[PDB]
Amino acid sequence: LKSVHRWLSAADQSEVVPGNDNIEYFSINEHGRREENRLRLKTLLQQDVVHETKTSTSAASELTAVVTINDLLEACQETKPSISTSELVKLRGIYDRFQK
Amino acid sequence: LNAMSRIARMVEKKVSQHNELTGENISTRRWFDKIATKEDTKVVVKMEDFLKAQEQLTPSVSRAELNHYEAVRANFEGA
């Protein structure tokens, strides 16, 4: 989860608005609509149709951003255990109470 | 079951050896219909197996339950 944002969200710079195609409309001055205007024009212009648009830019995978284990280290401090010594003590009994 | 697992391992070794000799063209299941070694499959338990097993098996009841049933008997039979 923490990693998939790399390929999709791309820090809103690495896959979306990547460069030359950021501004293909002209200098808007008639109205102040700047960001929503360009977003609407981009959505409208994306009228092309494609199929089976496969790509394998990943190391050994299709359409994915491989998790850097170094970044995977950032997940250890969030996930939680289930803690109980009562269960540990209780398991003393089922197998012949470890006495008989 | 232990003594017969031993025979299972032995037949596995035999079938692996045969597969190595040939082009590894058959599994154990095919081996058992193409070939048969009846006398080899006759498992005979040697008490070494017993002395192995006896170390591993628990009693079916604890002392807690057994004393209960002992008292029950005492009540009904002891009089």
Swiss-Prot record, chain A:
Superkingdom, taxonomy of origin: Eukaryota
Induction: By oleate.
Subcellular location field: Cytoplasm, Cytosol; Peroxisome membrane
Range of residues in the leader sequence: none
Protein family per UniProt: Belongs to the AAA ATPase family.
Function: Component of the PEX1-PEX6 AAA ATPase complex, a protein dislocase complex that mediates the ATP-dependent extraction of the PEX5 receptor from peroxisomal membranes, an essential step for PEX5 recycling. Specifically recognizes PEX5 monoubiquitinated at 'Cys-6', and pulls it out of the peroxisome lumen through the PEX2-PEX10-PEX12 retrotranslocation channel. Extraction by the PEX1-PEX6 AAA ATPase complex is accompanied by unfolding of the TPR repeats and release of bound cargo from PEX5.
Note: Present with 2100 molecules/cell in log phase SD medium.
Comment text on domains: AAA-cassette D1 is required for interaction with PEX6. ATP-binding in AAA-cassette D2 is required for interaction with PEX6. ATP-binding and hydrolysis in AAA-cassette D2 is required for proper function in PEX5 dislocation.
Quaternary structure (record): Interacts with PEX6; forming the PEX1-PEX6 AAA ATPase complex, which is composed of a heterohexamer formed by a trimer of PEX1-PEX6 dimers. The PEX1-PEX6 heterooligomers associate with the peroxisomal importomer via interaction of PEX6 with the peroxisomal membrane anchor PEX15.
Entry protein name: Peroxisomal ATPase PEX1
Naturally occurring in which organism (per UniProt): Saccharomyces cerevisiae (strain ATCC 204508 / S288c)
Swiss-Prot record, chain B:
Subcellular location: Cytoplasm, Cytosol; Peroxisome membrane
Domain of life: Eukaryota
Domain notes: AAA-cassette D1 is required for interaction with PEX1. ATP-binding in AAA-cassette D1 is required for attachment to PEX15. ATP-binding and hydrolysis in AAA-cassette D2 is required for release from PEX15 and proper function in PEX5 dislocation.
The protein's assembly and partners: Interacts with PEX1; forming the PEX1-PEX6 AAA ATPase complex, which is composed of a heterohexamer formed by a trimer of PEX1-PEX6 dimers. Interacts with PEX15; anchors PEX1-PEX6 heterooligomers to the peroxisomal membrane and mediates their association with the peroxisomal importomer. Interacts with UBP15.
Family: Belongs to the AAA ATPase family.
Misc note: Present with 1630 molecules/cell in log phase SD medium.
Entry function: Component of the PEX1-PEX6 AAA ATPase complex, a protein dislocase complex that mediates the ATP-dependent extraction of the PEX5 receptor from peroxisomal membranes, an essential step for PEX5 recycling. Specifically recognizes PEX5 monoubiquitinated at 'Cys-6', and pulls it out of the peroxisome lumen through the PEX2-PEX10-PEX12 retrotranslocation channel. Extraction by the PEX1-PEX6 AAA ATPase complex is accompanied by unfolding of the TPR repeats and release of bound cargo from PEX5.
Identification of the protein by name: Peroxisomal ATPase PEX6
Species whose genome carries this gene: Saccharomyces cerevisiae (strain ATCC 204508 / S288c)
Gene: PEX6
